[PDB]
A = this chain, B = another copy of it.
């Protein structure tokens, strides 16, 4: 799975 930084505000590490 990819480890993708993400934000909608906080930044989070999404796991895809």
Contact = CB atoms under 8 A, between A and B. Distances in A.
Interface in A1-16: 1-16
A12 B3 contact: yes
Interface SS majority for chain A: strand
Contacts of A14: 1-3, 12-13
Nearest to A4: B2
Contacts of A10: 1-2, 4-5, 10-12, 15
A5 to B, nearest CB: 4
Contacts of A11: 1, 3, 5, 7, 9-13, 15
8 contacts: A1-B8, A1-B9, A1-B11, A1-B15, A5-B7, A10-B10, A10-B15, A15-B15
